[PDB]
Design a binder for this molecule. Structure first.
Ligand SMILES: C=CC[C@@H]1/C=C(\C)C[C@H](C)C[C@H](OC)[C@H]2O[C@@](O)(C(=O)C(=O)N3CCCC[C@H]3C(=O)O[C@H](/C(C)=C/[C@@H]3CC[C@@H](O)[C@H](OC)C3)[C@H](C)[C@@H](O)CC1=O)[C@H](C)C[C@@H]2OC
Length: 102
């Protein structure tokens, strides 16, 4: 059951856990139980998120495996992310907030 699914310009509420290749976890929203909120497809987030999160239903989970060209490239994001790194995100969509009227 999925009456609405994510499209560009939607505001998404998401839980995530990010891991590096060696399985070590570098960030997660679950411990503080505070979902991350962003607008899809506006360039607010790394490309691998904007491209990997379309057509999603609330309640759906996805595993994203993001190569560094779609992530933080050659400079990375010190201290948690080295340059050239592949990122693994496990994500869950909690809510779609979509501007309905004009
Ligand atoms: C002034 C404070 C900064 C401001 C911080 C917040 C609102 C708090 C928010 C929870 C972020 C987290 O803070 C605990 C933390 O999330 C990470 O741990 C992480 O899991 C991650 O990779 N995420 C977060 C979840 C969405 C995907 C990705 C991201 O796209 O993040 C986005 C990101 C960094 C995009 C850059 C922007 C510049 C481009 O040039 C670059 O390159 C294209 C891509 C984040 C959300 C930015 O929009 C907003 C911010 O950065 C980063 C490893 C480090 C990051 O803190 C820095």
């Amino acid at each position: 059951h999925c009456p609405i699914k994510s499209r560009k310009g939607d505001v998404l509420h998401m839980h995530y856990t990010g891991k590096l290749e060696d399985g070590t976890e570098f960030d997660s929203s679950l411990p503080q139980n505070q979902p991350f909120v962003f607008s899809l497809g506006t360039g607010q987030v790394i490309k691998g998120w904007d491209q990997g999160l379309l057509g999603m239903c609330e309640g759906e989970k996805r595993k994203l495996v993001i190569p560094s060209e779609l992530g933080y490239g050659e400079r990375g994001a010190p201290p948690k992310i080295p340059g050239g790194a592949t990122l693994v995100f496990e994500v869950e969509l909690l809510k779609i907030e979509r501007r309905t009227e004009l």
